[PDB]
Amino acid sequence: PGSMTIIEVKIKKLENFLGNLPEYATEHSAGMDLVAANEQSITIKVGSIQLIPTGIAIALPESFEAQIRPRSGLAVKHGITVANSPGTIDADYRGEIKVLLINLGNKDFIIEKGMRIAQMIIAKYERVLWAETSIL
Amino acid sequence: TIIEVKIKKLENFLGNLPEYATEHSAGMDLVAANEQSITIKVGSIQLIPTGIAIALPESFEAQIRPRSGLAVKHGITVANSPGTIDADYRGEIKVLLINLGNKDFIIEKGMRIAQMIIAKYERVLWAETSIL
Amino acid sequence: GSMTIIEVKIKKLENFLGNLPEYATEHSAGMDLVAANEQSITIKVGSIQLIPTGIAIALPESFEAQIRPRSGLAVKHGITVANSPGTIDADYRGEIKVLLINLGNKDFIIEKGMRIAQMIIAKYERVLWAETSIL
């Protein structure tokens, strides 16, 4: 394990947060595991959508975005996925990160605090300047 | 660093071209350009035109992603998310919406229906092997 | 005077057929992934089904492969990728499988050879958290 290129990102624990900040499973992971921080159990009925808090807020540096993506095993095993995927967190969004889950499986599913519910991948984006034309 | 992208208004476009909300925004809001109101009933999938076509430079893609508010409040999201626009796609950008909520929802022209984030992609050269 | 590429090791599994995933043109962002199920698979309306592709890859560090929906399949049949965008990184060396869901109006048969998803390779960044009380 040698040198590594990182981007430093400010993050705040809110009152409902427990445990560690979002972690990369390994040194080779593209995404950090987001963890449910709802104080009381949340049931997602078949077909229903529920917003799940994470208890963290971040301030991304300019030109970097955080993508909220589905955790694959949850979709494969329970049909649980991220209803607004991929979620876009940019430097403007400094409120609590919340994961919008939908139950597209065949059984009701309970979200409990501590459950891994989504992945967060940080990447660069570009800024477009439009050049309007009548011929493409 | 800013990238210039050619954009064409088609006959059905209105208002200003897709805009970044602020200097820190990752994406531009895509706006519905349907001439008549479109109802997306529960479970239905509907293609919404935007009235624009773009010509991306090589190595750049535009990603069509859901707007958070429509999904949180109405279960409306982008059915083929994220949509991939690249330098080959020079036709009209259309947003494929699905209603996974519990109430019918009307798409009106002028409504913000998706986000467009431009990013770089890398071109893969495969190295075939029997041993990973 | 060249284009920029990233070289990625790829292994064909026994069920793979045809050429390695291809870019449609020199200007394409993604490669077409092809169904590699040996027998037809029916995806009933509302059902979710994992479709194998017959490949495994070894991405270099800080590169990911995104598994994204193929637009025509969603527009015409309501078939899309249920865990989209799928994230393949350097740790995943198993067979790539596409998780499809049928949100259309008709049961749909996935046949071997069908294009079922797009694969776009991009860089990601590694976050170092800086914890603070004021954002």
UniProtKB/Swiss-Prot annotation, chain A:
Give me any GO biological process, just one. Answer: dUTP catabolic process
- Per UniProt, which keywords does this protein have? Hydrolase, Magnesium, Metal-binding, Nucleotide metabolism
Under the heading Pfam families, the entry gives: dUTPase
What's a Gene Ontology MF term here? Answer: magnesium ion binding
> Which cofactor is essential here?
Mg(2+)
Q: Which reactions is this enzyme annotated as catalysing?
A: dUTP + H2O = dUMP + diphosphate + H(+)
Q: Where does substrate bind?
A: R71, S72, G73, N84, T88, I89, D90, K98
Which pathway features in its UniProt record? Pyrimidine metabolism; dUMP biosynthesis; dUMP from dCTP (dUTP route): step 2/2
Give a yes or no for keyword Membrane in this entry: no
CDD domains given in the database record: trimeric_dUTPase (cd07557)
Stated EC number for the protein is: 3.6.1.23
The EC category is hydrolase
Q: Does the keyword Oxidoreductase apply?
A: no
What the record says about family reads:
Belongs to the dUTPase family.
Function per UniProt: This enzyme is involved in nucleotide metabolism: it produces dUMP, the immediate precursor of thymidine nucleotides and it decreases the intracellular concentration of dUTP so that uracil cannot be incorporated into DNA.
> What is the protein's given name?
Deoxyuridine 5'-triphosphate nucleotidohydrolase
Please give the organism.
Answer: Rickettsia prowazekii (strain Madrid E)
Traced from the root, the source organism's taxonomic lineage reads: Bacteria, Pseudomonadati, Pseudomonadota, Alphaproteobacteria, Rickettsiales
From Swiss-Prot, chain B:
Report a single Gene Ontology molecular function: dUTP diphosphatase activity
Q: What pathway is it annotated to?
A: Pyrimidine metabolism; dUMP biosynthesis; dUMP from dCTP (dUTP route): step 2/2
Keyword Hydrolase in record: yes
- Coiled-coil spans are none
Q: Which Gene3D superfamilies match?
A: 2.70.40.10
Task: Cite the EC number.
Answer: 3.6.1.23
Q: Which reaction does it catalyse?
A: dUTP + H2O = dUMP + diphosphate + H(+)
InterPro entries recorded for this chain?
Answer: dUTPase, dUTPase-like, dUTPase-like_sf, dUTPase_trimeric
Quick one: a GO biological-process term for this protein?
A: dUMP biosynthetic process
The broad enzyme category this protein falls into is hydrolase
Q: Which domain of life is it from?
A: Bacteria
Q: Which residues bind substrate?
A: R67, S68, G69, N80, T84, I85, D86, K94
- Explain the purpose of this protein: This enzyme is involved in nucleotide metabolism: it produces dUMP, the immediate precursor of thymidine nucleotides and it decreases the intracellular concentration of dUTP so that uracil cannot be incorporated into DNA.
What name does the UniProt record give this protein? Deoxyuridine 5'-triphosphate nucleotidohydrolase
